[PDB]
Design a protein around this ligand. Structure first.
Ligand SMILES: Cc1cc2nc3c(=O)[nH]c(=O)nc-3n(C[C@H](O)[C@H](O)[C@H](O)COP(=O)(O)O)c2cc1C
Ligand SMILES: Cc1cc2nc3c(=O)[nH]c(=O)nc-3n(C[C@H](O)[C@H](O)[C@H](O)COP(=O)(O)O)c2cc1C
Ligand SMILES: Cc1cc2nc3c(=O)[nH]c(=O)nc-3n(C)c2cc1C
Ligand SMILES: Cc1cc2nc3c(=O)[nH]c(=O)nc-3n(C)c2cc1C
Lengths: 430, 430
């Protein structure tokens, strides 16, 4: 592999779980704490990370996780972070389902100008049915139609980004010609879902226009990402699954007539790094133990529930519960029984691990760096998006894993440049 | 008057004119120059200004002024400026015509959290017919209906801001109660124009919720501002007109059952401050002279056009042109003829002044401070929104006028507090 691996940092307030915020080290106000976001962003920039990433959603209930209840909105926090960072990308989730493309186009391009060409857009078709009812709609469109809407939305956004050629603004004080009128282009778009005349009232950025990220995993979504995205998010459930996703999406991109190397695949990992195997495992256990055990056992009960687990002593080995009642959830139950027997887990531990599974990327910096290199060399990844809910795991990753990857020649010593496109290794499409 | 006068700073890139950008001192890239915006914002904060203000529009053509062609978008530039300012308010224009209230509510409240309670919203019903065609509409609603839409939009935005009570987030790690469910409130709004269930996914800010600004001047708009706004923008065409506007809007606010002192009126002025009367006049003339004279004379020709002005020597006195062809534009033409005779203006000078009129607020700091005090004491203003297109006029205002108003006891020595509500003298509505 002639290329270097890249990382993004997902900054996610008090985190992705129901009860992680209860750890002594967590600031339960993190999700609306500007200092927290700034510190995390600057830590990722110290690690030469290609970008930070702000995930988003548009509907909550009393049962939504704490981070989702009360948090920053993405374009605003990214713009605030632009002023206190230098080279790191600024990638935010925005939905195609509700907001007009002119608005999204303008806000992303303005962020691109504020930041000197670091903006990115994680394009999502909102999957949250209730979000429709926050935006004056009775219901969401069906899955397939959501991706039709998204294609038109994206086409308009990119069309509007190209309203002005890169050299349109000649600013000639002597002649009074502020712009070259031949370099201005109206979109004049009249489609099924959007009608947008243009032109956009902001020109090209220092990277041309923002970078597009996408996370589709269905048949439709994978094809949409391969057709449209500069970078693609995916999961890291197993090396084998992630390798297959990578190859499939790269093949789709070729089918769409693109160079597959122009499509950068980033699986998400949440590594737990510590100086010893035992210290990392301790940190995992500290977090896994936070879940109210009754809630975890009840959720565990799902995969069995031919039994009442509240009979069994929590601190005795997981019972030999087992009845093939169809394959109702038997692919999982078999997995659960295996791991419980393999590591002699108690009922309590099984419940805790099901509520908060143990990452593969746990242990010493050398181990975690080696696994990352293995996934990279196996073409499971062009980089990773790194979650850091557990306090200190971003710091530990930057301080201890990055230098190993640098020493091994898999990671740069310095930022490639000042724009997101340059640091991802992409060109500017003007 | 027991209260102090307040100022806002309108930051407007290369400015509000067609040709001001051609002055030697102007940076023609100002409208997308982050440094320019940051410098202006910090200058206003040095002057203890209550807020900065970002105006906006959503439609352009080849004839739009240079600033409108290529500029920052408001929520993004305000959020970026939040990170490099401390106490000064952050007020942006957003339209009720196109964007959904959930989005606007979220973005403003997120800015309010990022900035520690400095956000403000200048609510406008977009008057630009072409903006409709940038947002998948055939045309704008009629004027009256635009204000009906705006009322519902604002009601939903404010409703959503109150999804969470100020003390809802108890963050009790020991019990696991992250929030008090009794302090969460769904909007469940089902109106003519919007249907928005809620709740909003961000809580109360340090000033409760953002401050609402409005600039309505029609019968309908004045009533809407008196009913809804915390602060109102208006013009400064003459002391008499602005006094009448002030009294009218304060009376309307009482009719709506509000305390008129809770409604702060800010006329817009663009002062030209210099150490001598003659130096200030020189600066005005330098800018007035930039307009292509042919364009200015043609525009001047409008108010006459019973003549071809290209006959008359530019540098000879303005002719005694005059025929009461109806009152077609005779209230103005009479004014034009009067001033030309009063100051013995040439054809060229008349054309130049019509293209770029001379502010009343021109001359020494002592004069400009005295005029401001006179307007304040006459109840024409609770403060002023200060434009600064001409390079250095914000600096000159802060450095030379503010200290006089401080010495005279009309202006504070220090910020009152860290929130926009506190510095405007308003309370938080929770
Ligand atoms: C790194 C990563 C980030 C994601 N961010 C979001 C997000 O911000 N908002 C969201 O609704 N879903 C997010 N997802 C979930 C994906 O959107 C979802 O799995 C995918 O869209 C399903 O594919 P489909 O659209 O074809 O159905 C993310 C997934 C990954 C792997
Ligand atoms: C200080 C000030 C700021 C203004 N900012 C904007 C603006 O950002 N966008 C806009 O379209 N109009 C702006 N205007 C123009 C007013 O919106 C317009 O004169 C007013 O809405 C007319 O009243 P009406 O809505 O009742 O018709 C501004 C006016 C003033 C005095
Ligand atoms: C990595 C990942 C992040 C996600 N983030 C959000 C989010 O921020 N808001 C939301 O409503 N849903 C999410 N969802 C559903 C997510 C899903 C995944 C897989
Ligand atoms: C003070 C003032 C500011 C304005 N600003 C804008 C603007 O930024 N964009 C726009 O399209 N129209 C404006 N308009 C029409 C304005 C009008 C006034 C009176």
């Amino acid at each position: 592999r002639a290329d270097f691996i890249q990382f993004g940092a997902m900054i996610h307030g008090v985190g992705g779980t129901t009860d992680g915020w209860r750890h002594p080290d967590v600031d339960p106000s993190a999700s609306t704490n500007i200092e927290f976001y700034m510190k995390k962003a600057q830590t990722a920039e110290k690690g030469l990370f290609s970008f930070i990433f702000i995930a988003d959603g548009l509907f909550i209930s009393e049962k939504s996780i704490p981070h989702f209840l009360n948090r920053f909105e993405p374009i605003t926090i990214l713009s605030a972070l632009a002023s206190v960072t230098k080279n790191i990308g600024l990638v935010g989730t925005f939905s195609t389902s509700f907001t007009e493309p002119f608005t999204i186009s303008r806000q992303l391009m303005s962020l691109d100008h504020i930041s000197g060409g670091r903006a990115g857009w994680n394009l999502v078709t909102s999957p949250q049915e209730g979000a429709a009812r926050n935006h004056s709609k009775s219901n969401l469109p069906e899955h397939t139609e959501r991706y039709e809407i998204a294609q038109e939305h994206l086409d308009v956004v990119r069309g509007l980004w190209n309203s002005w050629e890169h050299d349109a603004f000649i600013h000639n004080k002597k002649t009074g010609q502020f712009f070259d009128q031949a370099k201005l282009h109206r979109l004049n778009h009249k489609g099924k879902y959007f009608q947008v005349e243009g032109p956009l009232n902001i020109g090209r950025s220092k990277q041309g226009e923002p970078v597009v990220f996408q996370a589709g995993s269905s048949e439709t979504g994978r094809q949409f990402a391969a057709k449209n995205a500069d970078a693609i998010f995916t999961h890291s459930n197993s090396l084998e699954e992630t390798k297959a996703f990578y190859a499939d999406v790269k093949s789709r991109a070729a089918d769409e007539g693109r160079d597959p190397s122009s499509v950068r695949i980033f699986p998400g990992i949440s590594p737990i790094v510590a100086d010893t195997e035992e210290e990392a495992e301790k940190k995992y256990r500290e977090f896994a133990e936070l879940i109210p055990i009754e809630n975890a056992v009840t959720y565990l009960a799902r995969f069995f529930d031919d039994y009442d687990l509240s009979v069994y002593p929590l601190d005795e080995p997981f019972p030999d519960i087992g009845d093939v009642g169809k394959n109702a959830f038997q692919s999982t139950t078999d997995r659960i029984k295996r791991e419980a027997k393999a590591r002699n887990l108690t009922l309590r531990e099984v419940a805790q691990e099901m509520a908060f599974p143990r990452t593969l990327f746990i242990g010493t910096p050398e181990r975690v760096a080696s696994l990352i290199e293995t996934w990279f060399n196996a073409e499971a990844a062009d980089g990773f998006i790194v979650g850091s809910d557990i306090p200190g795991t971003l710091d530990a990753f930057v301080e201890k894993v990055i230098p190993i990857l640098q020493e091994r020649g898999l990671y740069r010593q310095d930022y490639r440049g000042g724009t997101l496109r340059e640091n991802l290794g992409l060109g500017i499409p003007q």
